[PDB]
Amino acid sequence: LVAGLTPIEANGYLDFFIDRPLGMKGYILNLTIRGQGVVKNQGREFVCRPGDILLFPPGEIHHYGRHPEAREWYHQWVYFRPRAYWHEWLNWPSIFANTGFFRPDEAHQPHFSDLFGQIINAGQGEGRYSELLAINLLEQLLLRRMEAI
């Protein structure tokens, strides 16, 4: 767990498109908080809105940025190599290829972007056991997803 938040601003610093066509060895959950995002894949084009958590399993093409009509795309991301049991709570409904999708119900959403947010901090924390809490919260989050669906 190394996690963080990326503030894409139109015409700003990191306003480039991340483009990892052959993926990574680790899972990446992506949660839009501000602006719209545009996850692209083989000619297709989804479009995230805030409150959306997308799953990018090992090997998935990573290609997304700010959707051309959006003024930005702030989003927290968490990169991780999953715990043993975790595997089961990682079969998520795709949109195209095996890029997972979530989008809580009005009531569940705040706590999810809130529980997700808690992960980022933990993981980016100058602390002793803080790497584990991130892992632990990353755990709690997924569990939460189940009890939801």
Add this chain to the structure above:
Amino acid sequence: LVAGLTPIEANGYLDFFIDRPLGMKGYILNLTIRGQGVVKNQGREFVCRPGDILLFPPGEIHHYGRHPEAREWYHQWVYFRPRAYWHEWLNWPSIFANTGFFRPDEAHQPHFSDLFGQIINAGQGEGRYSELLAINLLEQLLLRRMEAI
């Protein structure tokens, strides 16, 4: 994780002393919430106060009840067989024999009896994956203990 809360009331229903002189195969964290408790062991006698979380490792003699001058001793308890890594966050300062001891600082206490409480509910919940959240929260709790000391 099977957990619960036990409301000892003077002269009431369960106002008897639990007496397992040869312990159990599982760990038991004990958190006083109301009244005073009296953990006894080989002629000795500690005395818990609310906010106290005590550890009872496998094999520990379990013998405690309502301290004779207290009107009750409400306390949540959580019985569990620890996860692999967990082992490390379970060396706790004793009082007598290897009965662990905690007692947060004013600020940490509420969230701990609050995070502990969350475990009880989860575990006693009529739910799908709720047994795991209890386990997950039991995890978070211990981690919390570390970042504290």
